[PDB]
């Protein structure tokens, strides 16, 4: 640290490392980057990919939601106990994105044609996720391990986003079910999740949810 | 004890095998057929229903960036610390990006949208360039001075792009020396050049 956030304004792909730095205890700045600047094209130009979140931690700077959700995994101690669990929790990570990716795609380009067979397909995207927690401590703890890790903040806001999306959709999964409200019940996110800065934002970028 | 299990073609397992054999390891191959494939029980037992899966002794991962995290992790390419290990990543996550417009083209829009992919390229392409230049010159690594799991996934997204349009390195001298450099590694150029690299098509759908 210190940490700063630099993004548009919006949830979207900050709304997970955000509640991971929440829920630790930690503390960051929010950067907001317009429309209206982004065309103006110099931060752009000056990012490594040309896209946003920038992340800064004291003299580091990185680019990718993921290398954020990670580098505070590593760092903070949410990455498993070993290097095997350490795999699990990749493996529930890179699910959550491509859940992520196919959300976005649907946010973005095809809202109102593809919404109807996207909410035809959810249960079967998010069964895996009710099959890992069954496999482990019956799903009374988190996705991987008995310590919370950066996978189990990305899970918990793409199943958030969800029943925005498609209210009752994990009605059919009791797991997935309760550790929305187990997750959402810690202090220190309860207090975030209720706050301002989390609940004045709109999910994504055009009006949809 | 690694065993790989995959369709027949390089896909999103040509990186993880080039770092195998570049890490003098050995691994099977169990090939999933169309047919196999479309026949359910392999998919439905899968945890994401898609392959790759993977093999290590008693370990099953499936998604092929945990398999090369995992790889890269256990055999020590994942920097020299927690701050080059973020810099790994963050390559990854550009090679993933770029990977996944690739295979959006390849699969759903390859006649109409390649022209349009061909222009992008340059500038999809530069941040690698523009990385290599940040770290001694280009003459080493993508990260550090040590090979990463990232070096193996970049190394495949520039040789599948020399495919895709002959010549996309031409103006980018640091990423076009690297990769005749790592495949000039002695253990890489035999299984570059050895039948189960070079008898696998790139794709599925017979383009590149
Ligand atoms: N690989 C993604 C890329 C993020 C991304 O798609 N950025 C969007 C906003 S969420 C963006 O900067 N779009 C503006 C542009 O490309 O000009 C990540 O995980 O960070
Ligand atoms: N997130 C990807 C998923 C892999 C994937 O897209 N698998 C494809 C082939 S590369 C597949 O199994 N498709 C068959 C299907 O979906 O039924 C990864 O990194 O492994
Ligand atoms: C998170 C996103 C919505 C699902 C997203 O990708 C995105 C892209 C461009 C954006 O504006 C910059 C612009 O003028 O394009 C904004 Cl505000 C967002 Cl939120
Ligand atoms: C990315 C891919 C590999 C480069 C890919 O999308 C893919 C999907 C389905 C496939 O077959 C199974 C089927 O019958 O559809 C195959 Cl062989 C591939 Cl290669
Ligand atoms: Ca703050
Ligand atoms: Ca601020
Ligand atoms: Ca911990
Ligand atoms: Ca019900
Ligand atoms: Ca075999
Ligand atoms: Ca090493």
Redo the contacts between chains.
Sequence with gaps: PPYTVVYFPVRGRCAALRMLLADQGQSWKEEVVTVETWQEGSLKASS???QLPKFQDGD?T???S??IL??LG??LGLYGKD??E??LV??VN??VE?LR?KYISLIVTNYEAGKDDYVKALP?QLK?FE??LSQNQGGKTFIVGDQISFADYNLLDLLLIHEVLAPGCLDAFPLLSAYVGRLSARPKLKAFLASPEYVNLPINGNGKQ
């Design positions: 490594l990919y040309g580091l990185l680019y990718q993921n290398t990670r580098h590593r760092t290097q095997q350490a795999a990749d493996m890179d699910g491509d990716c079967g895996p099959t890992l």
